[PDB]
């Protein structure tokens, strides 16, 4: 986990979308494309955050398990 943030993910998605087609050029607030990509990137951000938290929890759990230090 590299701890990405929402703005970079959305910017990358919008940049690739523009690069694949010159027809789509309306990414203003309230647009359908921007909302969809925003939701996807938000979910990716939450996945990354929870993965970091779960890895921290896993490190504590493996320390407890390896030595049987209850």
């Amino acid at each position: 986990m590299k701890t990405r943030k929402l703005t970079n993910i959305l910017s990358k998605l919008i940049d690739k979308t523009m690069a694949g087609t010159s027809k789509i050029t309306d990414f203003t607030p309230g647009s359908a494309s921007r909302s969809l990509l925003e939701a996807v990137s938000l979910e990716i951000e939450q996945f990354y955050i929870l993965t970091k938290e779960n890895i921290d929890w896993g490190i504590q759990e493996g320390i407890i398990e390896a030595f049987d230090f209850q």
Partner: protein, 540 residues
């Protein structure tokens, strides 16, 4: 191959009686018709002015019969604001003096070694920065030889990048002639440069710009082994910077330079035209029926009257409603009615006040009321009357008496009478009379009766042209024509658009090219006197 197929029909789900307006506006292009459905669309298009207030009024004239697909136009011969700096040409989208306060200004960033643009327009709370102008890719070197340099130069005949060369010491590793080949874009170039054993042309971290290969700027003799040198192409990259977001367009006549945050100039609203004939022509074939000019001038009124007569002569019937002045005496109204004396023109006498949705208690002349009456008429069904309909006007500059109203109606002038404690509004429309004062003739005198006739004839013409003209002539054609006409006349009866029609009177005769047809109809009317007598009786 074998495959499944699927069709869908929608013609059974469903004239529209489109409404038009021409007037002064603070935004939008000149001499250009638009179709409007929402108020946010008109606000984006027309920034301000009377025309936007008339659109609002028309969509809020009546609670139950607001119009749709309003067609609007700007009469101001405005121009957009522009400016020049270095080799650049700056031109704004907005027409008029509003574009003058758009602020534009180029800067440089020392950390990125890249130009920067910033455009601010405080009227719309616009503030954006386009950092990293140019800086398309970085050239980097991983060898251990004496030196490593590159060079890109323009072709003066076309200002296109003649070559793109990588060198170790003095000789060349591989040169990409960008004026030819398939390396039209920078990405084709970098994808092959990175494959070299000891060279890289990494696209810049500031987004994937992906600019044309021919538009690269002129840079020669720069150390790759010491620095990650930037090839820039500032002008071609400004297309990527202003690809989608930006009020102001740019062009290059030369070299670009930074400059101060300077406001535009040259933005002109322009004087209004004296004659609207050239403006009016644009509505020749737009399909509109009711048009109202936003002007109190008798010359405009005569121009519109001529225009609607010409369009009615060309098979496109139209009607107009006019007004002007504040608190115009009855003499002026009679003079205006005598000057026009047109069936297809209606005069409005009263002027008053309207409560906008924004909260403005807008006191307006009489043509704004004529806009409202037109919007209510267009909202009504084909052949329904605007008699005794509510108007929702806040107040009026006069309260005409029962004799004054009888004089105005006898002179073919529309008027509004104050009325107390009715459920909807405190005002109603007394009559739907036209300027033509021949009350014996019901078609010319009454707006409703002639609108019914005109829509009936237009719909019959359009359907007969669409259906049978150009098809084949067979034995079943005549019967089919009669059945189609009968179905049409039964549809019209079902919609209450006519009173009744005898089916047997419909005759069809077919001979070669021609198709001779004849029929009878009892036309629609709306009541204008209602009488009720009572008889009293008793038992002993």
């Amino acid at each position: 191959r074998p495959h499944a197929s699927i069709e869908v029909d929608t013609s059974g789900i469903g004239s529209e009686k489109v409404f038009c307006l021409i007037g002064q506006a603070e935004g939008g292009e000149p001499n250009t018709v638009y179709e409007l459905r929402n108020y946010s669309q008109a606000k984006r298009l027309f920034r301000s002015g009377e025309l936007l207030d008339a659109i609002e009024l028309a969509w809020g004239s009546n609670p139950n019969y607001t119009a749709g697909r309003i067609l609007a136009m700007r009469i101001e011969d405005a121009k957009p604001a522009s400016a020049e700096i270095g080799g650049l040409k700056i031109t704004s989208k907005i027409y008029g003096n509003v574009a003058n306060n758009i602020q534009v200004g180029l800067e440089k960033n020392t950390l990125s070694d890249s130009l920067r643009l910033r455009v601010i327009f405080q009227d719309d709370r616009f503030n954006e920065v386009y950092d990293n102008i140019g800086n398309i890719f970085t050239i980097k070197y991983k060898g251990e030889e004496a030196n490593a340099t590159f060079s890109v130069e323009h072709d003066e005949e076309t200002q296109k990048a003649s070559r793109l060369v990588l060198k170790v010491g003095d000789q060349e590793v591989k040169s990409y002639d960008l004026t030819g080949g398939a390396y039209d874009y920078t990405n084709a170039i970098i994808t092959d440069i990175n494959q070299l054993p000891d060279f890289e042309a990494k696209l810049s971290p500031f987004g994937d710009k992906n600019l044309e290969s021919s538009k690269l700027d002129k840079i020669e003799n720069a150390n790759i082994k010491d620095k990650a040198v930037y090839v820039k192409a500032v002008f071609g990259d400004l297309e990527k910077q202003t690809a989608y977001n930006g009020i102001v367009s740019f062009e290059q006549l030369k070299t670009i330079e930074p400059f101060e945050l300077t406001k535009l100039k040259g933005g002109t609203n322009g004087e209004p035209p004296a004659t609207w004939a050239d403006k009016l022509d644009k509505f020749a074939h737009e399909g509109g029926y009711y048009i109202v000019p936003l002007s109190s001038k008798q010359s405009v009124h005569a121009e519109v009257a001529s225009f609607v007569k010409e369009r009615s002569d060309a098979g496109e019937p139209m009607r107009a409603i006019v007004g002007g002045g504040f608190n115009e005496s009855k003499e002026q109204l009679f003079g205006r009615q005598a000057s026009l004396s047109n069936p297809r023109v209606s005069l409005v006498a009263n002027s008053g006040t309207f409560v906008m949705d924004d909260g403005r208690k807008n006191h307006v002349p009489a043509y704004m009321v004529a806009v409202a009456l037109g919007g209510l008429a267009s909202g009504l069904e084909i052949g329904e009357s605007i008699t005794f309909k509510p108007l929702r006007v806040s107040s009026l500059d006069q309260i005409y008496e029962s004799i004054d109203l009888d004089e105005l109606n006898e002179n073919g002038i529309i008027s509004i009478e104050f009325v107390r404690n009715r459920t909807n509004t405190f005002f109603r429309i007394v009559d739907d009379v036209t300027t033509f004062n021949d009350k014996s003739d019901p078609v010319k005198a009454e707006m409703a009766v002639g609108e019914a006739n005109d829509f009936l004839v237009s719909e019959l013409k359009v359907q007969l042209e669409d259906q049978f003209i150009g098809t084949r002539t067979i034995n079943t054609s005549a019967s089919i024509i009669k059945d189609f006409i009968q179905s049409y006349l039964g549809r019209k009866k079902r919609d209450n658009e006519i009173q009744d029609f005898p089916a047997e009177d419909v005759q069809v005769i077919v001979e070669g090219n021609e198709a001779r047809i004849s029929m009878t109809v009892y036309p629609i009317r709306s009541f204008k006197k209602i009488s009720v007598s009572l008889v009293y009786k008793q038992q002993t």
